[PDB]
Subunit: 507 residues, 4 copies
């Protein structure tokens, strides 16, 4: 029961010594125990996520209220997990950073990942969102460009603020994101004291087949706490895993984190009465115009018994929708859908949906076959095994009858490559700057000043142009901050940093 | 229960049409059903086995007699699967060719694979052998050289007899193998009417820790049938899957194939009284000097419900030995042990031993962790999960106490790269030529003559030298056969072959 | 210069013996030469193509005439490779079957692959087509269903006509394809005597940005030859590589195969004057209504120096278009575009476009970085290496200015999952049946009769219904053929086939 | 020249917008530019090294003196790169940590990697060593056990000192390593101010075939600087890439780091006059008994132009030896040799030795073929391409004639699994404790005290037993440190750490 074996089932008698010619002689190839043990060890590492590499997972449950806001949930969506009051749905959630790889400090400035996997009766639903309600760009084509500038340089393997704002200098749509990111909101204190949002615009489909535009929001019961740059540096001094440790230990002691699910519902259409496009993920929907409607509550109450098998292998996709949910023409959203399935086949495996953490908690009958590491076949009991196709007069799985009309929105336009007609990259950025608290603006100006100091002046002028366009005080305060820090830099001594205490050889 | 779903568990309502803008318009990225279905389809194929690609599998059982020959089995080995009379052990067997890839004709000239996986109580045991009792080479270093000459040319993608015997011209040790291969024995009629053997020399270890040299043999109850070149060409005309079809359909109708397991036991040592090395896998052990000892009987009685998941993903390794079995200093055998584990991590997967077909049918407790497509963790119930190492004062699996002395043979010599001192590459080759039946020799001479006709004369002279060294009649008959066929080739017309009936465009 | 080395550059002194303790002793781990050699050998095989696995490649050149038909080529397209008379463009072509894997007989019934890669000055252009002008299905969602029924059964690993027509019974749109496939046209005699076509509908864009619907055709100068089933069985008896051998040997002796490129141009639009949809790939365009227009001629004159490095690693994609070419709303075509890139990253590699055979023969400047086996970085001379994104004020590659208007067709409709309004699955099928020659119809009826004999009657009735709808005589002849063949089967006895000559053990 | 293109060579006109139906409509599959760009991006990440993931690389040169110490280098070795005075050999060096993954703080306690690749005329030579002269274990079978305890826990994803010393409690041979590791020597200030060593025992072979035991040492010209835990915490606060930054910035400004290569030569044999085994890698060779002999000097003077393509893809193996160098019976060394090639085929690729950074800078002629991402074939000019095997009468690469006798040491003994007869796990550990400086001992006791505080007492007692066996004062000081720190912990209150400043929702 507790006897050490090989994966072939061979009981191991000596886990200490290799088989050699003499006690101090050479190893022979008569060492299967050694081979198998090391063969598997050499291939433990799978490639990390191209983004959101550093993360932590937790199991939990979602409770529905049966209604959206103060009116029945059936009015806007027919998603089965929402229909009944008190209906519990098992979930797995992974929190994460964005920029740097695994085992990187969780005190770094970054958006935070907030992915929730709903194991519903209509299959799985992945809500792949972040902490901030918006994103840097509005077109998915710019994503590898954004990440490359955000990630460590291919020449130094270190993040560069110059490289970061170099891309921002040509991307005015990221202004609103920067205003949030370089504020204290760019470094959440922990995952428990953090907001969540689907960022992109989605759609809800009801019994009638009617669709409405939808925003998702996670509101923490624990409240919201942010980490200033001074505070972040202090934590990082002795702890580069503080956020992972915070979530795990809280669940371990019974202090279960909770989030309330809110939704913003909007009538389908262009809405020309707005100065912004509702399909722009660099835009928020004002609560005074589009109030938040309560849907349910999620509680995380169980830690993974194995980080790799569950959290690391967990795979989330925006296309993973259940009946009642649908896409919108958010160009960012539809772009995402492609990459998730694409990257997960490579990272987690060809049959990654057959893994316990990714597999749905219900019946599955597909004609999909084979693939590497195929653990099971999606046949049903009594099926003619030789039938792996549809249609078939002999056997095999059948289509599901429609119990509700499909959502068929009207789409008209020319096949073009053009930006949206209402960019407005400075509008909401200025609003958020003014609506900030004093200590939040101070942190924003301080961070931007320290970041843009020493950077190419062509970049500086363009960023100052963007900040000024959002708010005059915004632009002026950053400009003065830059001039001040560039002046102080000029009056020091930039010799190479000396580390450690001088020592002498022991031999 | 029979409703078609995605692997996310989403019930599919339309498996016929993609989601498009209009019934005849362009596809959108709002097609997760399409994406997932095709995403998995594009990665169905895993790399085929580098050798023995074409094959067929079958489940079965092995019954032990409790004795070896007419004396107790405990005298020579302490392998648990042999100790009790009537003791049944589940097995999975894969038959195969060698040279060409999957879906290649099973009527081709090749050695035949005969791999048996024993799911014993001491873990799994893989007996990876062939139909012929010997092999081409005596050193594993020559294996990629042998296979490259055997396999289709890198310039034509077609097998070449000139390339084949080009390598044989510099490899006199393959003479005995050629004598068998180009005889009718090179094309077994089917897998059911075929012999089996471990080819390499192994070792049996008893209760005392004493070791003896061992040869394995599978004797078919159905008898032995071979396929002549004329007969093989006739079958190939309408059936390139005849051997796979033969085994499957026989089990399907209840005609279960059976093999008796025989063993040849030899005292450990150099044995200088022999003209051949007992560790040379190009050598057989004469029955008159080393009689065959019955051990048990194997019956194959169940076909795989899925060829890919079971047969294709099946992984066999010569190092996979249970207690009571051990290696010998067969340089070919020890070389094999490395490649099997090496190639299976790449082909089947990093966690290929976690697959149902490869996993042992007992308890497994290892400190091995992670790897791609990790379906489970080798922990035991109640274990401290954070302990994945040995030794440990906290928890984790423990070593197994020795219930019998380990086999510790004496090894003396200089670390050298040298061939065995008793090569004798022509001895047994000549014996087998003379011991052949008339119709077997006729086929041998006919095949060699047709193969060596047109080949470079430097190769021909060297091969004729080898054949003559084995037997004077052997060499002379092949020489005359070559001269005859080269003369007949000279008197024809070698225009490019014309195929099919002339046709005309339909448009 | 000719000295055998390791891939580390180490001169090999002994390629015959492994390093062991004594000439007949055990191998040590002191064998890097052995390790590296077998380590690479164990991973020679990459996964075969999920479809069109068996194939052969050839290098060549394409000559443009500068005009389409009798009018300038610039009138309809601005593709640079067509503009000048006598303009030569390097090409690589791979011919292939469809159903079975590598090293499978080329005498089997299948559509034949005809993929051409154009190394133009505007980058690469892949024309991924077949010999037949149409395909089985009109929606890419059905592709894995089609292939699964076409491919060997997951229970027997053998193709089954019952499984094939089981899918066809629920797919009436495949009727026209079947009419061609089970005719002599289903087995081309060789690749040189074979037609080629893009099958799908494409678009040509000129200087004005105007688009026109387009069909591609390859007409062999050598003529067209088809292989009857009786002729195919005779060839298969002694040669399962006859088509591969035919192309290679012809090029080797100087007999270079040639194809003339024809195009069918059609005004963009719905075209309600047709009984078929021009975007349906199960439909041909009648020459009497849409004449074939000559474009150029292609000549294949060089064989690959390495089959694997060139032919096996070759990657073709329908999305790989140069300026002047574009997509259509062919639901089949757009579906293909997804799968090629998806499967090639897995099969050939993440950086497969960096391989010599797939890499363009011009300038390449991308912001794409890394990936496994990254051989080079897409930077230009003098570039700031730390800039791998766009836009950038510092450095990096810049966008290309538009020298011609982009094609922006009007698209209106509801986001639906619905079939085309003009299916007409039997129309052209019947016409082709009547337009057949007598020997072509006889072969068609003979093949269908032998295939549908013994098959479940539910399948038979549906197929007979489809054949009859195309043509009354068509249905009746097949019906009579089935009744006749099912009757002769009833007067047989289905015992297990006996193979080979009885033999006796040699030991 | 600077125009942005696809990897197909297609000039990109719009790198900002995806192709959609209308400026704000859905994406179509008519987006190859989008597809290819994201398809490659989704697969940028390769699996990180299972150990030494975090690292930095640098190009350089090595100058030989032509002699070892004060006597000719030819006396002990015939390695070509050492024979001539002033002989320069191109090198690539990668420095690294051990425990945590990529982008992990370089201020962490760990051994430091020091891998050097020599591009010699006899091929490549990899000297894969660390900064410390010894290692934790003496048998490679314990390596995955060691790393698992050292690496973050599978339940918390955080390193645990309890898990670390849990393994050490059952591994007394790691005592000497711990004495160094928890001293200031466990955190080198930077890579430039750091020693290097091959750790394992190697062999040098001369013109006579005579072999001698060998230790390698890298002595930094810049001197040696270590980083205390207090100093490390201060650096980690604002910089987790300080060591990577230090090496890069130094080379960039012209301050090239230099190391002198020293060797320790010892007569081959058991050497019964020692209280330790010279093949034990947990043992150093006393300079007073075995003086350091100068060999040459290495200078690093060029930074990688691409971190991934060069540093990340760099592959080092202990088996990669040139003529004149050889193995010893160091059970640790021979174990390593297996794992490097095994893990690098998986990590870097099947053809990783074909990559520019790993490929030798000389002639390469192998019979190795294929493998994924095969960029070239190892054929020579004029070779018959169809010959990919040895021997061959037709063509192909030939063996190299021996210009010097091979080293063939005598090996006698029984095939056993047993530890060395002279373990002595506390001897040198105690000596190093006394030879330490006061500030070095203080740091050692301080680190051990803080680490073992709160840990299971069974572990504590075993470690205290090990420390005491090395030195009585050693054990007592740690014991007092533990008692003191466990007492101050008892006078605390272990509430959950509170992070960040309280904030409020912005919406
Ligand atoms: Cl709070
Ligand atoms: Cl899957
Ligand atoms: Cl399916
Ligand atoms: Cl039925
Ligand atoms: Cl018989
Ligand atoms: Cl495994
Ligand atoms: Cl283990
Ligand atoms: Cl315990
Ligand atoms: Cl690529
Ligand atoms: Cl790009
Ligand atoms: Cl390689
Ligand atoms: Cl080789």
């Amino acid at each position: 029961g507790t006897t050490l074996t090989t994966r072939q089932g061979h009981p191991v008698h000596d886990n200490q010594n290799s088989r050699t010619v003499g006690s101090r002689g050479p190893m022979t190839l008569e060492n299967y125990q050694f081979i198998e043990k090391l063969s598997h060890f050499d291939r433990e590492r799978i490639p990390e996520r191209v983004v959101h590499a550093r993360g932590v997972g937790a199991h939990g449950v979602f409770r529905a209220t049966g209604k959206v806001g103060d009116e029945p949930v059936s009015k806007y969506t027919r998603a089965k997990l929402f229909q009944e009051d008190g209906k519990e749905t098992p979930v797995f959630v992974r929190f994460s950073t964005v920029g740097h790889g695994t085992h990187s400090p969780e005190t770094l400035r970054d958006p935070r990942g907030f992915a929730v996997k709903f194991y519903t009766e209509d299959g799985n639903w992945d809500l792949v969102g972040n902490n901030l309600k918006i994103f840097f760009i509005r077109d998915a084509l710019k994503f590898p460009d954004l990440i490359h500038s955000q990630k460590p340089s291919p020449t130094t393997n270190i993040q560069s603020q110059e490289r970061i704002f170099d891309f921002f200098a040509g991307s005015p749509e990221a202004t609103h994101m920067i205003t949030l990111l370089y504020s204290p909101w760019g470094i959440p204190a922990s995952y428990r004291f953090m907001q969540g949002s689907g960022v992109n615009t989605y759609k809800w489909v009801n019994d009638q087949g009617e669709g409405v535009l939808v925003k998702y929001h996670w509101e923490p019961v624990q409240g919201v706490r942010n980490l200033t740059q001074m505070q972040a540096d202090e934590v990082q001094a002795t702890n580069f895993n503080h956020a992972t440790q915070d979530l795990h230990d809280a669940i371990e002691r019974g202090d279960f984190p909770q989030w309330d699910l809110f939704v913003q519902i909007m009538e389908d259409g262009e809405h020309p009465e707005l100065d912004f496009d509702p399909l722009d993920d660099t835009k928020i929907w004002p609560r005074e115009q589009f109030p938040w409607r309560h849907v349910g509550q999620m509680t995380l109450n169980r830690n993974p018994e194995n980080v790799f098998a569950e959290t690391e292998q967990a795979a989330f996709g925006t296309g993973v929708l259940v009946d009642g949910l649908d896409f919108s023409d958010d160009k960012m959203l539809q772009g995402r859908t492609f990459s998730y399935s694409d990257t997960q086949r490579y990272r987690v495996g060809p049959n990654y949906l057959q893994l316990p953490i990714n597999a749905p908690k219900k019946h599955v009958a597909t004609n999909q076959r084979d693939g590497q590491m195929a653990y099971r076949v999606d046949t049903f009991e009594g099926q003619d095994q030789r039938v792996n196709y549809e249609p078939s007069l002999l056997s095999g799985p059948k289509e599901a009858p429609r119990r509700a009309p499909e959502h068929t929105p009207r789409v008209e336009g020319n096949l073009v490559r053009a930006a949206i007609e209402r960019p407005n990259p400075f509008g909401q950025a200025g609003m958020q700057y003014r609506n900030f608290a004093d200590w939040e603006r101070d942190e924003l100006v301080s961070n931007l000043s320290g970041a843009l100091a020493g950077v190419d002046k062509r970049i500086q002028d363009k960023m100052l142009e963007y900040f000024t366009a959002a708010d005059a005080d915004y632009g002026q305060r950053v400009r003065e901050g830059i001039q001040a820090k560039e002046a102080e830099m000029k009056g020091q001594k930039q010799e190479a940093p000396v580390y450690g205490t001088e020592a002498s050889s022991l031999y």
